[PDB]
């Protein structure tokens with residue numbers, strides 16, 4: 088069992104590492120609005136959307152019961168972007184950079200938790 092403050096203290100640095108990536112985190116900081124972005128086909132392909140602001144709010148307000156729920160949401164965000172965007176596209180490459188950063192950061196944090 089995990090207290091929400093314990094999860095926030097341990098996991099927020101891994102999320103901050105993603106936010107720190109500029110420009111690579113810019114497609115992921117807010118939820119995708121297909122109308123604003125001019126990609127109205129998005130929700131036909133991405134049925135379970137996820138973004139950094141949602142993950143941050145969940146961590147801030149205690150909505151995760153255990154750390155693998157947070158890890159699941161981060162990977163859901165990455166997988167959505169790799170599914171929707173073409174392999175040669177800017178956003179796909181940005182996602183791959185974030186995933187490389189996350190893999191480096193999450194491993195020892197989960198070991199300390201556990």
Ligand SMILES: CCOc1ccc(C(C)=O)cc1-c1cc(NC(=O)c2ccco2)cc(-c2c(C)on(CC)c2=O)c1
Nearest residue numbers: 110113114115116117118119124126168171172177178
């Ligand atoms: C239509 C192509 O855009 C996308 C396509 C797909 C996806 C996904 C996540 O699958 C995301 C984006 C996307 C990209 C960028 N920026 C750059 O790519 C960039 C910045 C600098 C160089 O490149 C910003 C935003 C964005 C958001 C989410 O919220 N806002 C204002 C709140 C935004 O501006 C969204």
